[model samples]
Target chain A: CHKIPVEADFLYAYSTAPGYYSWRNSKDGSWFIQSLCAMLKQYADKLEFMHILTRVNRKVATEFESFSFDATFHAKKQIPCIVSMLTKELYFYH
Target chain B: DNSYKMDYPEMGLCIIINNKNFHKSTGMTSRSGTDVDAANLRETFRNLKYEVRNKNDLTREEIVELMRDVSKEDHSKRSSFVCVLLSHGEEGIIFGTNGPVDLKKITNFFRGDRCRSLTGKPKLFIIQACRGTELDCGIET
Candidate 1:
């Protein structure tokens, strides 16, 4: 038998990395959540959780771009961050 | 175990806290598109077989209270738990309608030593908020 950390099996999926702005459009939803929902629906059962999140990271990073009226906020890119402490693989097998 | 068990009778509860409006004093603008995120998450998680609860415009204390209450529930029969937060935030904190609270204060309620029912089970936190004011200008590869 082995002891595990108190915070084991936890996953923190953040919309942006530390010190980065997470963009959202008043018309459309956030880039990260939209990508996450898309990825989770498609891959939750077919892939491990982390693998699905990595795809989410790619989808948000490549497919989404901010189009704010504010010039400084426009044309910016964002990436999702996945901080996982899982000791085992997680599959949403039905 | 090589794989975490997902065969429990219940997948678990997924709590979505959507904070779109901010207090006048916080100097934060109302988060306009957050409701879209919340709705999408509810549908996605529901399809994944988790019971979803949606809350809106909770104050700082309300957010903490809600998590504390959730941690006290019997999750022994459940396979995992998930929390989705849609709000404005700086590093390490999420802004409520009235104020901001440390993110850790909310998640610590479910620590293995604190919430034994969740011990060895997956706890996922999906946070959609700005961590800071910096922007990322992607470079072409």
Candidate 2:
């Protein structure tokens, strides 16, 4: 069993957003990205599917001072092959 | 209480393992898009103020040796380290100029105990290779 939900956003703004990633430092959240990543890497042998999502929310379209980002890591152990996941930088707003 | 003490922009090193060629014996064709991939990453990391090192066409042992050397560097002043591997692979495996290399052999050297210089510092690894290479046929689509 994993620490956080695969589809649920590991971190959030108001409510219902859920938590996804662990900030390198702290996101006023739980867990660290490194720990979760390490755990996931261990099962790389027995798993079949994996996906991770990182998202940021500013509550507004043009603010950078106060913002929150979340990342979701998933492993589809039920799938038929090993899993794939991870990163870089991209821009998107929603 | 969620504050991150950001580090110096130029204090770290980024190592990129760019494997574009394979021994004819490996049975894998040359990777074409890898040039564009490495080029894009080089530009991106430079813009981030990092000193980037790109090494091309290495054997599995060479890859491990390079990483082992990198892990020994004094990172007391640096914030993090990054390694990018671009190769043809199948589930936790990356091909080398000689043959296949287990992904672990590359990363295991940098564990907190083994590489004290990077303890508590970030070690970013990017492995860009195909997994399983299995084609999936959609059912009754």
Candidate 3:
């Protein structure tokens, strides 16, 4: 039987180069993938489960229509989720 | 409660690593308008009652040393900690004047076990470095 996915025990976050990983709105540009990866790596113990990600076709993808990256979590709440959202925001420049 | 972090702002330290220029090898350009960003943050954080400190043009090793030292500070009296990193960065790495330092390592210094001073206290890191080089030009209507 399949097990329920833990909210904080998230899997990979991926995209076509400039997808959610490296893209964002005009106000704040996005953080590079490496930046977020570092944070996720650190919270591994606190997060319960962890995995590393790599990319092929590494060049930036063609821009998508009006996209804005966002993440929300408190440390006492979801630590890995915090890294997820923080990494997403790291891509942002606003 | 975690709410104490905000309620007792006087017990917090906000350290800003304002690294703008870089060595030739890092393949990064000097950040412009960061002084403005730094200035605004100073006022914003100071008004919040955090004791703000700024360090400029440090090497990767230096950044690591700084964090470790800061992490060792006794937080028994403070509500929390804040670290703001401003530098040339790509993905998980942020550049010091000398070279790249793993972003994870910089923050790991304050982990619950590594630095017991902040074991249960809230620690916040505010980073203002570009995560990637991608730019977004909105789609046509």
Best by lDDT: 1
lDDT of 2 by residue, B55-87 (tens): 999998898889889978887776556676777
CAPRI class assigned to model 1: high
B1-141, model 3: which lDDT tens digit per residue?
Answer: 212233442557888788878888877677655665565556656655668898988899999999989978877676667787777666776789989888778877776667666555556665555455544343333
Model 3: per-residue Cα lDDT at residue A16: 21
Q: What do the candidate models score in CA lDDT, each in turn? A: 0.92, 0.49, 0.52
The CAPRI classification for model 2 reads as: incorrect
DockQ of each: 0.84, 0.04, 0.05
C-alpha positional error of residue B23 in candidate 1 after TM-score superposition, expressed in Å: 1.0
* TM-score of candidate 3's A chain against the true A chain: 0.23
TM-scores, chain A, per candidate: 0.90, 0.21, 0.23
Q: Which lDDT tens digits does candidate 1 get at residues B1-141? A: 699998988999999999998989989998988889999999999998999999999999999999999999999999999999999999999988999899999999999899999899999999998899999988876
What's the distance in Å from true for residue B26, model 3?
2.5
What shift in Å separates residue B108 of candidate 1 from its native position after superposition?
0.5
* Model 2: lDDT of residue B84: 66
Error of 1 at B3 (Å): 0.9
Q: Give the clashing residue pairs of candidate 2, or none.
A: A9-A18, A9-A19, A9-A20, A10-A19, A10-A20, A11-A19, A11-A20, A20-A71, A21-A71, A48-A81
Runs of candidate 2 exceeding 4 Å displacement: A1-94, B1-4, B9-11, B136-141
